[PDB]
Amino acid sequence: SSNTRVALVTGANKGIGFAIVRDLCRQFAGDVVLTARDVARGQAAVKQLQAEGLSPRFHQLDIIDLQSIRALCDFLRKEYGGLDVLVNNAAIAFQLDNPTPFHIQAELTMKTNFMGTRNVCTELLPLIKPQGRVVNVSSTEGVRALNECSPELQQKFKSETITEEELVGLMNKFVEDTKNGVHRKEGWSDSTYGVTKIGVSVLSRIYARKLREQRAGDKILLNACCPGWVRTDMGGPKAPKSPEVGAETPVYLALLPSDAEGPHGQFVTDKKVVEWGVPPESYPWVNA
Ligand SMILES: NC(=O)C1=CN([C@@H]2O[C@H](COP(=O)(O)OP(=O)(O)OC[C@H]3O[C@@H](n4cnc5c(N)ncnc54)[C@H](OP(=O)(O)O)[C@@H]3O)[C@@H](O)[C@H]2O)C=CC1
């Protein structure tokens, strides 16, 4: 329903998500849709970008409100007849000193980081146009958390045949295991945030197969990635790189040139793919 291509980013009123929309408004040939769960916060962000010559469109979106997601679909369907670029950026993390009980932190982090991300995908993947790109912003914390789980769990996540059903099952188990205070007897990592990123990353793998299994001819590319340690409300003030820089790999994955057929279903960090599970080569100078 449109010959104009369109890109969309979740949780983009601030942080990396915001940075990503800026770069797209600059490097993407078509409309860029900035979304946010709060309209005021979201429109303000749009206004700020207009002050740079950029002109992105706005639309409300809370990836936790299934009804909010469906409305976006409607918007897209009618306005563009589909969607070309999707970047699942939105997320939360409970840091140190936050009183929230552990099992609750588990449940809420999972609820939006995995569940939310998945509900956006199941609803928008059908709308991705051929030559379309999908980027899921994960974290290397997922890999760290992956290596802390028991070899039995690691094997299940690293599987080539794991299903979307089994993945959703493992994520849910993790939450039940923490409420019942046994997740360690079950060989799980203590990192609720990390475990959710595992899910996002494995989910991307699974999605990559389904796409080539159900739409091989559509040349769609999908990958998960880590933007690095960045200065945001989530990253903290010590973070070495700024949002402008952090949005580099994600944007790169979003603009992969037409007909590339790779990378696909890969974990990308700093524009380079990284074997799933393989720990990070180095790490920034520590300034405690
Ligand atoms: N910062 C870092 O060092 C790293 C970040 N990442 C990943 O990058 C992504 C963005 O990180 P960062 O920029 O620091 O994040 P921020 O915490 O600065 O921003 C997160 C954004 O997601 C939004 N959001 C949270 N929950 C929801 C929801 N339910 N529906 C819609 N939007 C929501 C926030 O909304 P609102 O403003 O209204 O709260 C916000 O716009 C995340 O996926 C994160 O895990 C990965 C590795 C490192």
- Ligand 1 atom with the smallest distance to the CA of 231 is 1
Contacts of residue 131, Cβ cutoff 8 Å, sequence gap at least 6: 84, 218, 219, 220, 258, 259
134 phi/psi in degrees, rounded to 5: -125, 125
Does residue 238's CB lie within 6 angstroms of at least one atom of ligand 1? no
Task: Assess contact for 215 and 126: CB atoms under 8 A.
Answer: no
Give the angle subtended at the CA of 48 by the CAs of 45 and 54, to the nearest 5°. 105
User: What count of Cα atoms within 13 Å lies in the side-chain half-sphere of residue 56?
Assistant: 33
Q: Tokens for 288, please give them.
A: 């405690």
Amino acid making up residue 90 = A
From the CB of residue 92, how many other CB atoms can be counted at a distance below 10 Å?
16
Resolution reached, in Å? 2.3
Distance 88 CA to ligand 1 centre (A): 10
Distance 12 CA to ligand 1 centre (A): 8
Question: Which of 10, 89, 244 has most ligand 1 atoms within 8 Å of CB, for mutation?
Answer: 89
Three-class secondary structure of residue 266 per DSSP: coil
Task: Assess contact for 63 and 69: CB atoms under 8 A.
Answer: yes
Alpha carbons 33 and 16: distance in angstroms, whole number: 15
- Catalytic positions are 193
Question: Which of 38, 110, 232 has most ligand 1 atoms within 8 Å of CB, for mutation?
Answer: 232
Q: Is the peptide bond before 263 cis (omega within 30 degrees of 0)?
A: yes
Alpha carbons 92 and 37: distance in angstroms, whole number: 13
Q: Which residues pair with 137 in a beta bridge?
A: 225
Instruction: Output the residue whose Cα is nearest ligand 1's atom 40.
Output: 11
Amino acid making up residue 142 = G
- Asked how this structure was determined, the answer is X-ray
Interhelix angle 66-80/117-124, nearest 10 degrees:
30
Q: Tokens for 1, please give them.
A: 């329903």
Q: Tokens for 22, please give them.
A: 């800026």
Task: Assess contact for 197 and 113: CB atoms under 8 A.
Answer: yes
From the CB of residue 26, how many other CB atoms can be counted at a distance below 10 Å?
12
Distance 265 CA to ligand 1 centre (A): 22
Contacts of residue 37, Cβ cutoff 8 Å, sequence gap at least 6: 11, 60, 61, 62, 63, 64, 65, 68, 90
Fold topology of 1-288: Rossmann fold (3.40.50)
Instruction: Output the residue whose Cα is nearest ligand 1's atom 11.
Output: 16
35 phi/psi in degrees, rounded to 5: -130, 155
E strand or H helix at 135: strand 128-137
Do β-strands 272-273 and 267-269 pair in parallel, antiparallel, or remain unpaired?
Answer: antiparallel
Lay out the sheet containing 267-269: strands in order across.
Answer: 57-60, 31-36, 6-9, 83-88, 128-137, 221-226, 267-269, 272-273
- Ligand 1 atom with the smallest distance to the CA of 15 is 13
| CA distance readout (Å), 244 to 90, 162, 231 | 17, 35, 10
Task: Assess contact for 211 and 223: CB atoms under 8 A.
Answer: no
Task: Assess contact for 101 and 178: CB atoms under 8 A.
Answer: no
Does residue 20's CB lie within 6 angstroms of at least one atom of ligand 1? no
Residue among 27, 122, 25 nearest 73 (CA) = 122
Distance 216 CA to ligand 1 centre (A): 31
Task: Domain ranges for the chain, please list them.
Answer: 1-288
- Ligand 1 atom with the smallest distance to the CA of 239 is 3
82 phi/psi in degrees, rounded to 5: 165, -155
Q: Tokens for 142, please give them.
A: 């997922």
Alpha carbons 138 and 79: distance in angstroms, whole number: 29
Ramachandran area for residue 53 (φ above 0: left; ψ -120 to 50: alpha; else beta): left
Instruction: Output the residue whose Cα is nearest ligand 1's atom 25.
Output: 91
| Long-range contacts at 46-52 (CB < 8 A, ≥ 24 apart) | 49/21, 49/22, 49/25, 52/22
Q: Name residue, tokens 């600059």.
A: 26
Residue among 4, 5, 9 nearest 247 (CA) = 9
Task: Assess contact for 41 and 70: CB atoms under 8 A.
Answer: no
- Ligand 1 atom with the smallest distance to the CA of 16 is 13
Q: Tokens for 193, please give them.
A: 């945030």
Write the secondary structure of 88-134 as one string of H (helix), E (strand) and C (coil).
Answer: ECCCCCCCCCCCCCHHHHHHHHHHHHHHHHHHHHHHHHHHEEEEEEE
127 phi/psi in degrees, rounded to 5: -90, -5
Q: Name residue, tokens 């994600």.
A: 250
Q: Tokens for 266, please give them.
A: 């890969």
